[PDB]
């Protein structure tokens, strides 16, 4: 097995990456929740998806905090009581108010809780010794999440900003693969190029829906043939990435 | 003496009719909310629409208590926050849990409040001096509600039991027309025959969707031809019935 300290290079660089994304998450969530508290629906809607990109890019770490992640990011699908669940809070609760209902009424406390929760997450990440097995395992976890809910447009059922989250997951996974390139190369000379090709295929389909202002079209614009073309490469990436924990001597 | 055709007669009889329906509403609501608290989803679903018929038949009086009516019977449409509104309670809040979400989780307090609210309504109706203009105008008020939400199937957006509510509104309006028939036919017997024929047309179409028990098909079963055939009679009735207050000197 591989001693975690032998992976300090890529693990340290990943914590720097996660920390930078978390700093941006906090600053964007401050602005997003301030807009909600101020009743500025248009500004809140514009900030929603760009803010979430920073969370979706660091899911391998955020999901280590199971209850906090649920507070920040649970979907309607996660609640027996649906949209009416008292425990349905965070981004998707505000997504419903802003995009389906066009309101900020009584959303102030939900916005305040979301800001408090992301500031909590920032502190927990600062305190965290990053386990390389969770980092390395995180790329496969991200691609499994893409396969489960993002290809089908089931992450943002009211704003339909799923492509922002999709691209964030992919970017967060590619970052992990890139950082561990030397360690992968020591055991498997062909692996990085194999996954790079499938990442490039996914990135090219996603790029068909980027906008000049720096965003994405809504999910209803994604053609059925592009949706179908994503399934294969995403599944092959998930399978390939699922071998890395073992290959690198972490489990 | 009191004249034999004095309006104190039919208004008294309407309070009896409303009182009898509210007695049934309380007993059925007890059984409906008991099932919700028990977790018996199948029984609660079967009791939902027959319970509501008694409320829908007396809406001219129930809607005089604005906050109570909202607590018992508001729709998602009535809430800026939609399904997540804390003040979304009563029949349609439980309708969402039972029919959309297939759950009774945490619905106990909502069921307790619905039973308490209909018991409140029962006491308020007993204490109420019925305003004769609200009684006589109640037939038009009910037909306007049919035209606004029942004919288009927008009353029960999760259970789709709108035909029960449709028929209940129609029956409650026909009761008012029948009670004031002696006074109306003093003034305009041709007008009364015109109203009866449109009621008979509506009842004949609705009867096409009755089931073997005193039930109705769900709204999706209503053929588009039968929907368009309902539109004319309902709108003629809404206009004709809007003249009753003036015909009886209550404007």
UniProtKB/Swiss-Prot annotation, chains A, B:
Coiled coil: none
Functional summary from the UniProt entry: Part of the iron transporter system efeUOB/M involved in iron import. Specifically binds Fe(3+), which is produced by EfeB-mediated oxidation of Fe(2+), and delivers it to the cell inner membrane permease EfeU. Also binds Zn(2+) and Cu(2+) in vitro.
GO molecular function: metal ion binding
Record note on quaternary structure: Component of the iron transporter efeUOB/M complex composed of EfeU, EfeM and EfeB.
Predominant place of localization: periplasm
Protein name: Iron uptake system component EfeM
UniProt KW keywords: Ion transport, Iron, Iron transport, Metal-binding, Periplasm, Signal, Transport
Organism: Pseudomonas syringae pv. syringae (strain B728a)
Domain remark text: The peptidase M75 domain contains 2 metal binding sites, site III and site IV. Lacks the N-terminal Cup-like domain present in EfeO proteins that contains metal binding sites I and II.
Compartments in which it is found: Periplasm
Similarity comment: family membership: Belongs to the EfeM/EfeO family.
UniProt keyword Cell membrane, yes or no: no
One term under GO cellular component: periplasmic space
Gene Ontology terms: biological process: iron ion transport
